[PDB]
Amino acid sequence: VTCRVPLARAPDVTYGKKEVTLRLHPDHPTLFSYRSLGAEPHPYEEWVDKFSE
Amino acid sequence: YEHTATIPNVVGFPYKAHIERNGFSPMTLQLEVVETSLEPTLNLEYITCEYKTVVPSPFIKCCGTSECSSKEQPDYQCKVYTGVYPFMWGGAYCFCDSENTQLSEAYVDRSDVCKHDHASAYKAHTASLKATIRISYGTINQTTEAFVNGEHAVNVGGSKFIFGPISTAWSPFDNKIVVYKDDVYNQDFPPYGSGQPGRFGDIQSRTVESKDLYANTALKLSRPSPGVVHVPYTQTPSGFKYWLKEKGSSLNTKAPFGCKIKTNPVRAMDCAVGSIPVSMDIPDSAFTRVVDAPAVTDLSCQVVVCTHSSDFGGVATLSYKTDKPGDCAVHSHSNVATLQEATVKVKTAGKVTVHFSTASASPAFKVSVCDAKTTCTAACEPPKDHIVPYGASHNNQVFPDMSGTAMTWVQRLASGLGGLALIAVVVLVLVTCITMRR
């Protein structure tokens, strides 16, 4: 079957020199992750359940 | 007519190849990679899924004894407990107070939905890369799929293209791969026949339809408690149902070079690694004769503005003579700056504007409009916007030209110091000569 899942809020982007700052406002434990698109991705993974930057 | 190029293996980067076939007006081809798909050759090692533990009703023999037997069943356990006196709801089950036994028997089986919810453990090697390339030139504007090897020639409008062997051996898949539904995992799974209780592969099957099964789940029976009919046992919980929560996020969130991982078949899409040679055979119907082309002459270049930004941040005006209006191929003969357009309309107004992208403080690329050639020198300011939602349209060549300001200062300082050093040398040589004659 297909299960309906929510979409989290689009995070508030603000851009610094070689930095993206996100403000993350979850309703429920929400997986935040990122990686670099280079040869060394250094993947980050976090279940964000608190309103956090 | 053979020609060759080498396009970046960058999706949506519209590399432009310029062909200067001496009998014809030049042409620029645009070669944009629409997709790539790096697909490993997979050999299935085994299937893993949740186990089912079969625990039949206990064979309680009242007033008598029983004997266990070995059976050809995975992780099978069987023990006879002597001196049981079980009570059912209405009273003791046996009339004999201690002359009874319970045969406790349990064994492991493949779960009933392992047909549907299983993880397949693979060895992944010898990956083949297929790319989808968009070819456009003149009136032809077409998308084609080609295997990226020096062998698969593909037709486009009567041209033939060979997209030569990818200039790397890299692939994101390790030698051992676990595939599960939409996910892929780099995981050094244990060999078949070698899985351990409560870890991935605590039961293993060579195929889904295999009748045999390896199982090592640490199933142990223990004695029925005094007065109860229950077959009490202990077993390490299914290593697959542990894995399913221990997996973390799949290779799709961790692969280098921005690869996007997909299953059915297992492939890494749109990796940004290496470069793709191209061999191009172009028919005489694709070119235009030099008698028909415009005689673009006295071409000159001036740069209106330049930003070394990731978009086409530079603008140039090219000025020329021509005999007739027409279309010319236009190209930048230096990787320091990539043009946006492949062709430009030439008119008796005698000037036109061309847009380029560059990564250097002062590029000195050179451009052609048809057969004419000119050099463009720019002073390029940095961008102000720190971050952008799109990749660089330039080749990231950042070293400034020797005519640029930084290198002009370097040249002035170097020739000043070296000229003084050569003065000191000439003086010392003339002194040592004269004081040798003395």
Question: Residue B181: what residue type?
Answer: K
CB-count exposure of residue B415 (10 Å: 0-12, 13-18, 19+): exposed
Distances (CA, A) of A4 to A1, A7, A10, B70: 10, 10, 18, 50
Torsion of CA B139, B145, B148, B152, to 10 degrees: -80
Judge whether B137 and B17 are in contact, CB under 8 Å.
no
Cβ contact B258–A18 (<8 Å): no
Whether the CA torsion B92, B98, B99, B104 is positive or negative: it is positive
Measured between CB atoms, which of B253, B254, B258 is closest to A37? B258
> What element of type H or E holds B106?
strand B101-110
Left if phi > 0, otherwise alpha if psi is -120 to 50, otherwise beta: which for A37?
alpha
| Rounded CA separation B23/B288 (Å) | 9
Q: What tokens were used for B111?
A: 């779960």
Q: What tokens were used for B140?
A: 């032809």
Nearest CA-CA distance, residue B315 and chain A, Å: 26
Q: Does B390 touch chain A (CB under 8 A)?
A: no
Q: What tokens were used for B178?
A: 């676990």
Q: Does A33 touch chain B (CB under 8 A)?
A: yes
Phi, psi at residue A26, to the nearest 5°? Answer: -75, 150
Q: Which of B182, B212, B172 is nearest to B47 (CA)?
A: B212
Nearest CA in chain A to B391: A37
Alpha helices in B95-213 (DSSP H): none
Cβ contact A41–B255 (<8 Å): yes
- Other C-beta atoms lying within 10 Å of the C-beta of residue B418: 10
Q: What tokens were used for B110?
A: 């493949």
Q: Does B158 touch chain A (CB under 8 A)?
A: no
> What element of type H or E holds B429?
helix B405-437
Q: What tokens were used for B267?
A: 């492939």
- Other C-beta atoms lying within 10 Å of the C-beta of residue A41: 18
Best B252, B386, B388 residue to mutate vs chain A (most A CBs within 10 Å) = B386
Q: What tokens were used for A51?
A: 């309103």
Question: Residue A36: what residue type?
Answer: S
Q: What tokens were used for B174?
A: 């390790």
Q: Does A42 touch chain B (CB under 8 A)?
A: no
| Rounded CA separation B37/B259 (Å) | 9
- Other C-beta atoms lying within 10 Å of the C-beta of residue B38: 25
What secondary structure letter does DSSP report for B200? T
Whether the CA torsion B38, B39, B41, B42 is positive or negative: it is positive
Cβ contact B253–A45 (<8 Å): yes
In Å, how far from its chain's centre is CA B172?
6
| Rounded CA separation B263/B179 (Å) | 8
Measured between CB atoms, which of A38, A40, A45 is closest to B249? A45
Best A2, A35, A36, A42 residue to mutate vs chain B (most B CBs within 10 Å) = A35
Nearest CA-CA distance, residue A21 and chain B, Å: 11
Measured between CB atoms, which of B253, B258, B273 is closest to A33? B253
Q: Which of B414, B394, B381, B196 is nearest to B304 (CA)?
A: B381
| Rounded CA separation B188/B203 (Å) | 16
**SS3 (DSSP) at B258:** helix
| Rounded CA separation B41/B26 (Å) | 42
Judge whether B339 and B355 are in contact, CB under 8 Å.
yes
Structure's resolution in angstroms: 3.1
Judge whether B271 and B33 are in contact, CB under 8 Å.
no
Distances (CA, A) of B248 to A4, A31, B48: 22, 11, 18
Q: Does A31 touch chain B (CB under 8 A)?
A: yes
| N residues, chain B | 438
| Rounded CA separation B210/B200 (Å) | 19
List of residues 6+ apart from B379 with CB closer than 8 A: B303, B306, B361, B362, B404, B405
Distances (CA, A) of B402 to B115, B354, B361, B407, B411: 68, 24, 11, 5, 8
Q: Does B269 touch chain A (CB under 8 A)?
A: no
| Rounded CA separation B260/A41 (Å) | 13
Map tokens 């200062």 to a residue.
Answer: B409
Cβ contact A43–B257 (<8 Å): no
| Rounded CA separation B146/B132 (Å) | 6
Judge whether A30 and B247 are in contact, CB under 8 Å.
no
What secondary structure letter does DSSP report for B409? H
Alpha helices in B170-295 (DSSP H): 239-246
What secondary structure letter does DSSP report for B204? E
Judge whether B298 and B374 are in contact, CB under 8 Å.
no
Q: Does A10 touch chain B (CB under 8 A)?
A: no
Q: Which of A10, A24, A12, A14 is nearest to A53 (CA)?
A: A24
Question: Residue B285: what residue type?
Answer: S
Nearest CA-CA distance, residue A53 and chain B, Å: 18
The residues that bridge with B109 in the sheet, in sequence order, are: B52
Question: Residue B131: what residue type?
Answer: A
Q: What tokens were used for B418?
A: 């070296």
Q: Which of B103, B51, B38 is nearest to B77 (CA)?
A: B103
Q: What is the DSSP string of B314-358?
A: EEEEEEEE-SS-EEEEEEESSTTEEES-SEEEE-TT-EEEEEEEE
Alpha helices in B149-308 (DSSP H): 239-246
Judge whether B146 and B130 are in contact, CB under 8 Å.
yes
Question: Residue B301: what residue type?
Answer: C
Question: Residue B32: what residue type?
Answer: E
HSE (CB half, 13 Å, CA atoms) of B151? 5
Torsion of CA B77, B198, A49, A40, to 10 degrees: -160
Q: Which of B91, B80, B171, B84 is nearest to B124 (CA)?
A: B171
| Rounded CA separation A27/A6 (Å) | 10
| N residues, chain A | 53
Distances (CA, A) of B320 to B10, B314, B348, B393: 34, 20, 9, 27
Q: What tokens were used for B4?
A: 């060759």
List of residues 6+ apart from B8 with CB closer than 8 A: B15, B33, B275, B276, B395
Torsion of CA B155, B157, B160, B163, to 10 degrees: -70
What secondary structure letter does DSSP report for A27? S
Q: Does B251 touch chain A (CB under 8 A)?
A: no
What secondary structure letter does DSSP report for B289? B
Q: Does B181 touch chain A (CB under 8 A)?
A: no
Q: What tokens were used for B117?
A: 């919810």
Map tokens 């009136």 to a residue.
Answer: B139
What secondary structure letter does DSSP report for B307? B
Phi, psi at residue B415, to the nearest 5°? Answer: -70, -25
Judge whether B330 and B369 are in contact, CB under 8 Å.
yes
Judge whether B64 and B100 are in contact, CB under 8 Å.
yes
**SS3 (DSSP) at B241:** helix
Whether a cis peptide bond, with omega within 30° of 0, leads into B277 is: no
| Rounded CA separation B227/B102 (Å) | 12
Q: What tokens were used for B130?
A: 């297929």
Cβ contact A15–B257 (<8 Å): no
